[PDB]
Every structure is written in C-alpha cells, then in structure tokens.
C-alpha cells in the first residue's frame, strides 16, 4: 500500500526542484506574452497571479500529485508562447466578468438558500 511508483520524482525535495525552474519559466514569460497577445493587464499583476495558482495547491504532500500539477502546469506555458491559446484563453484566468461572490454569512443568507 504505502510502497508506490515514482511517476517522475522519488521525493518531495525534487518535486519542488521541478516546481522551481518551471516557476522560473512561468516567471520569465510574462513580458513577452503580455506584449504579443495584446492585452491590457500589467506585467506585475501577471507576475503575482502566477503566484496565485502556484498557491492553492501548495498544500499536497504526495510527491506524485504535486509533480502531476508540474506537468499539468508545464502544459500551458508552451500553449501560450506558441500563440496556440487565445486572448479569451488567458483572460479566463483573470476572472473578471462575474460579480464578487459573497464571503460573509450575511451575504449568502441574503442572496439565497444555498451554502
């Protein structure tokens, strides 16, 4: 049960090692993608956003899972730099069209009967 297959990394140490340089690539690209995709957002909000999706799953301990998001996250940086994706495909991450969802208990209660 505990003994299992190393898809790409034995230990969580080399898991971050795969996260590191991929973040470096996912850090370097921002000025060029923002340039040729012809957006309006600034580079810095692109930079701190890259942090944002690097954050939500920064809580798993299984080495296979984390490096599975490594290849998962490896799979859009080229989908962007070879202009395969669209402007609608990277503004999608910049969730903008929806009104701010409710955070306080009062706001949920006012809106409707749904947790």
């Amino acid at each position: 049960g505990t003994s299992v297959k190393p898809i790409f990394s034995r230990d969580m140490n080399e898991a971050k090692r795969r996260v590191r340089e991929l973040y470096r690539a996912w850090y370097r690209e921002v000025p060029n993608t923002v340039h040729l995709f012809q957006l309006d957002i600034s580079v810095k909000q692109g930079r701190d956003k890259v942090r944002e999706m690097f954050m939500k799953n920064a809580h798993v301990t299984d080495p296979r899972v984390v490096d599975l998001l490594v290849i998962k996250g490896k799979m859009e940086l080229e989908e962007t730099i070879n202009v395969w994706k669209q402007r609608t495909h990277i503004m999608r991450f910049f969730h903008e069209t929806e009104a701010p969802r409710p955070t306080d208990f009062l706001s949920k209660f006012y809106v409707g009967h749904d947790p």
């Binding site: 340039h35 040729l36 012809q38 309006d40 929806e98 809106v111 409707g112 749904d114």
Partner: protein, 342 residues
C-alpha cells in the same frame, strides 16, 4: 414583492433577479453597457427603440432568450412610452443627443421626454426611476447642453420625487465621443485647443464604474430620491489629457492655441453638414468648461464602487487609434498624466 419577481439563481444569464428594466435609448454608448450589466444576473429589460432593428441587432447576445424584448417607441407620441412601462419594476432613462437635430432640440431631448416618461412611470405604478443628467448641468451655464439638462433635472425631480438622479462628470470608453474625439483631431493638423487648454479641468469616469453604479443604485433601497454624482479618482487639466492620450496613442502631439471666437466659427461650420456633425458649438465650449468639486452630493463610493483610474483602462480604447508602428506598444512607454489633486 410579486411572486413572479422573487430573485433566483446565482446571478447568471438564465437566473431571474426580479428587476424589470425599461432602459430608454439604450442603442447608444452607455445604454449598451448597462444592458450588458443588466443581463448579467438575468433582469428582463424592455429597451424601447426608435431606430432600425438592425442597429439594435447587437443587443441580443446580452441576455437569455426572451429576456431582452424590443418594443417600437416614439418620443413625441404619448402612449408610446406607456406601452413599455406598465409592467416595469424600474425605469431607466438615458435619452440624449449631443448635437442639434431638426426634429429634436436640446430642450426637447432633455426636459420634454424625460418629464413625460417620468410622469407616465409614476402614473403606471413604477417603483423606481434612474434619470441621468450631467455633473456639469448648470441652469445658467453657457452651454445649451448643461442648461437644458438642469431645467429637465428639476422637472423630473418635481414630477418624480423618488427619481434617483445620476450626474457623471464625463464618460470615457470605447466609443465615448470624448477620447476618440480628441484622437480624431489629427486629421485636421494641430490640436485646436483655445489658449493651449491650460485653464480647464475634467474628471472622467469609466463605463464599467458608472454602468455598475446604476444597478447598485437599483438594488439599494435608500437611493430613492437621491442625487448621486459620479466622478473619477483624479482630475486633470485639459492640456493634461491631450498630450497624454496623444502619447498613449503615440500620435504626433501638435498643440495649437487659437481664439475662442474662431473656435466657435469652426464649430458652426462643422454643423452645416446634413449628416452627423463632427463637432458643434455646444461641445466647443463644453470641452473648455471645468467641472465642479462638490462633495455634498453622494458619489459612487457610497454605493460601494471604486472609480477606476483613467490611465488604467485606456489601453483598451486608444489602442485602436494607434498606427501599425505602435499597435503593440504597451502603456509602460506612456506615463500617467499630471493629476491635479483636490
């Protein structure tokens, strides 16, 4: 509230919010965006129209099927307004022409029809009204625009005591006739700003800010009878926008002062065109007019919206006026204009 008007859904397109808008003259700049925001949580608008339905074709994909009805309506006719406002929880007025017309004058488009729609809406049994005026609407202002707005403003306020009033300072956006109007000056040589435009201050407002401010006013129960005014976060001198938007468009900046009377002469000459005039005497002296700073009137911050900076959402609109040599130039090259703090 009526049983059929109880809001539901997660505020999506096919969700029902119970608000029944009847936006007037939405086939324009800001009327486009409010309907777009109106269809966000699925509020059935009526949007009476007078132009050809083809010019109204582009408003369909902002709401679920049957949420955006289209009704033919004539301003001069009386029953035309009533036929679209009987079953409306709210009524939104946005009618306004920025130039003189043979069949409609500034008075007719700013006191005649807003009072008429307000009195039928109260007669029909509407629950709210959002009549928009100008922040610069002064009864004794030199501009025919602002004085016509002012007399209508007290007219609708008297006709509808609870009519919430919106007076945005100046609207800037994709087709604002404000930013693109300045950019269009390139075809006529240097910029014809009187006395180098060193004596005029404006505080522009983004569309998403004001358009949202409408339906926060709609959902706010305390907005009845208020007179909210919407202003941007920073003011700028008239000469402070011109070179900035020229620079953000990377066009050759050529300021050129000239007498105001000749500036009026140019405005009249452009009015002689039978089609839509490029400029009129009204906007001739409206540009050089400087907005007030009145803080007593509640602002968009009262409802809970922060006024986005002019420099922040400008690349979306002024990118079009750039040439091939600057179509990919970012806004880092340009710098924010010299804001005049209050």
């Amino acid at each position: 509230l009526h049983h059929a008007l109880i809001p539901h859904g997660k505020g999506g397109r096919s969700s029902v919010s119970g608000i029944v808008a009847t936006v007037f003259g939405a086939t324009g700049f800001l009327g486009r965006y409010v309907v777009n925001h109106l269809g966000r949580m699925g509020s059935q608008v009526i949007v009476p129209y007078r132009c050809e339905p083809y010019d109204t074709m582009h408003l369909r994909p902002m709401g679920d099927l049957g949420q955006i009805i289209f009704m033919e309506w004539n301003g001069k006719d009386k029953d035309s307004i009533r036929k679209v406002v009987e079953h409306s929880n709210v009524v939104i007025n946005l009618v306004g022409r920025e130039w003189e017309t043979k069949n409609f004058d500034f008075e007719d488009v700013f006191v005649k029809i807003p009072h008429a729609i307000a009195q039928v809406s109260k007669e029909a049994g509407v629950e709210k009204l959002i009549h928009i005026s100008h922040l610069n609407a002064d009864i004794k202002s030199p501009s025919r625009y602002l004085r016509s707005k002012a007399v209508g403003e007290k007219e609708v306020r008297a006709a509808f005591p609870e009519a919430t009033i919106i007076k945005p300072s100046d609207i800037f956006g994709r087709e604002d006739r404000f930013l693109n109007y300045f950019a269009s000056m390139r075809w006529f040589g240097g910029v014809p700003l009187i006395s180098l435009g060193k004596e005029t201050v404006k505080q522009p407002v983004y569309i998403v800010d004001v358009s949202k401010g409408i339906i926060n006013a709609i959902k706010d129960p305390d907005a009845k009878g208020k007179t909210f005014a919407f202003v941007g976060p920073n003011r700028y001198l008239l000469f402070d926008l011109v070179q900035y938007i020229f620079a953000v468009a990377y066009r050759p900046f050529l300021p050129y002062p000239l007498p105001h009377f000749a500036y009026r002469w140019v405005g009249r000459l452009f009015e002689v065109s039978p089609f839509e005039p490029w400029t009129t005497r009204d906007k001739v002296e409206r540009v050089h007019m400087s907005d007030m700073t009145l803080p007593h009137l509640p602002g968009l911050e009262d409802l809970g919206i922060q006024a986005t900076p002019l420099e922040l959402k400008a690349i979306e609109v002024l990118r079009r006026h750039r040439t091939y040599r600057w179509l990919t130039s970012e806004m880092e090259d340009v710098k924010p204009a010299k804001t005049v703090n209050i």
